[PDB]
């Protein structure tokens, strides 16, 4: 039940420059034998927590010279001297020195990335779909920056809200960018009963908004 | 080389007791070190529950006490971690791992997902996502496939057996009425599509599923 309270719960790092992650327990982390047990994980997208650094400053096996760690007692701080596309993930301190171990919340960091206008591509149903008697409409805006970004549906011209699923990627650890899925969904009736689908968005990089439609009676 | 890897069920009903199996390879869980079972809850904070050292000694989560228990059988080199009267609040990935927090070794499972739920497993229903006239200027182009109406997760997709993944992006699972919905975009040069073929390989484990489709043009 000892907390271990991280700052910030998200960092932005422009690649090239230096990053510092903060760690900070309830209690004194200084052991009877001298040692201070703490801990550095890594989290990769897709991947399992890795060890980076142990008795606060020791580092391990393969890890980058990049990687530094240093506190004592209660104020522990993990630093990247710079920071690279690699690095993206989620950074946990653990405390191994009073039952039970216990991990802080964790700090994602993010790559800030030189802004980028969304690739949209919008997908009919798939006449396969169809026969089973649903309809869903695809969307997808593809390697974009920042991940602020607003999508909205129209058929017939009039807004549609209700029956609409977002779902945001990771960022990109190769470009440094974000991707989104909106999905509208609707039955084989109501899709048959309208003609024009447009997907709408509207982010940062435009001062009018993008647009992809069909109409579908054309195909 | 070292390795632990978890084995057991992926869907639990509540009430249920939770089994899972970590082998280990590599190293004699009876030589040295203690042999953890982690889990990570969706959201991201992770929960030390329990050990059992190479000696046979257990350690567990205060919290955890009233329906844990670590066991293990030294002559598989495997320890199996039970829990019970499962909720729907013990759903998360489960890891085992093994580390000192003084030496140099450390070594986590790739971890498994346990969902719990009254739900039934769902084979899903693929589609292929093709344009309906984009492929127009523009030298790349994006196809899809959606994935919809399974449970539980995950699934695993793929494009081209794998012979493709240079511009691939795969969309997290949404839960939309007791059943997840899926998509996958891939993005290739005008060149590959409709000339040579694309396809999006999706496999469900739970249902033993494994579905190919072919992203073929609408005529219109």
């Known amino acids: 039940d000892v907390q271990m309270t991280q700052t910030p719960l998200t960092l932005s790092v422009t690649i090239g420059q230096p990053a510092s992650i903060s760690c900070e327990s309830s209690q004194s982390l200084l052991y009877s034998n001298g040692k201070t047990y703490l801990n550095w994980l890594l989290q990769r997208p897709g991947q399992s927590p890795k060890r980076l650094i142990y008795?606060?400053?020791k580092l391990d096996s393969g890890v980058p010279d990049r990687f530094t760690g240093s506190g004592s007692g209660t104020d522990f701080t993990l630093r990247i001297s710079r920071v690279e596309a690699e690095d993206l993930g989620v950074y946990y301190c653990?405390?191994?020195?009073?039952?039970?171990?216990?991990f802080g919340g964790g700090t994602k960091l993010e790559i800030k990335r030189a802004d980028a206008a969304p690739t949209v591509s919008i997908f009919p149903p798939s006449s396969e779909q169809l026969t089973s008697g649903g309809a869903s409409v695809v969307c997808f805006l593809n390697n974009f920056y920042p991940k602020d970004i607003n999508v909205k549906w129209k058929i017939d011209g009039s807004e549609r809200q209700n029956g609409v699923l977002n779902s945001w990627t990771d960022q990109d650890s190769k470009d440094s960018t974000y991707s989104m899925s909106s999905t509208l969904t609707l039955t084989k009736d109501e899709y048959e009963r309208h003609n024009s689908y447009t997907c709408e968005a509207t982010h940062k990089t435009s001062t009018s908004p993008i647009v992809k439609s069909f109409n579908r009676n054309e195909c | 080389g070292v390795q632990l890897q978890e084995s057991g069920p992926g869907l639990v009903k509540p009430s249920q007791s939770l089994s899972l199996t970590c082998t280990v390879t590599?190293?004699?869980?009876?030589?040295?070190?203690?042999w953890n079972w982690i889990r990570q809850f969706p959201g991201n904070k992770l929960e030390w529950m329990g050990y059992i050292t190479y000696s046979g000694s257990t350690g567990y989560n205060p919290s955890l006490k009233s329906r844990i228990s670590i066991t293990r059988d030294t002559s598989k080199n495997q320890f199996f971690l039970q829990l019970n009267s499962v909720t729907t609040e013990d759903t998360a990935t489960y890891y085992c791992?093994?580390?000192?927090?003084?030496?140099?070794?450390?070594?986590w499972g790739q971890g498994t997902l346990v969902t719990v739920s009254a739900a039934k497993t769902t084979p899903p229903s693929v589609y292929p996502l093709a344009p309906g006239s984009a492929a127009q200027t523009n030298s790349m182009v994006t196809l899809g496939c959606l994935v919809k109406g399974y449970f539980p997760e995950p699934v695993t997709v793929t494009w081209n057996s794998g012979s493709l993944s240079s511009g691939v992006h795969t969309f997290p699972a949404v839960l939309q009425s007791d059943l997840y919905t899926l998509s996958s975009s891939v993005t290739v040069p005008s060149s590959p599509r409709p000339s040579e073929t694309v396809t999006c390989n999706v496999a469900h484990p739970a249902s033993s599923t494994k579905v190919d489709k072919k992203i073929v043009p609408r005529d219109c």
């Open positions: 791992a093994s580390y000192d927090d003084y030496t140099w070794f450390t070594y």
């Open positions: 653990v405390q191994g020195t009073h039952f039970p171990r216990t």
């Open positions: 590599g190293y004699s869980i009876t030589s040295d070190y203690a």
């Open positions: 008795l606060v400053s």
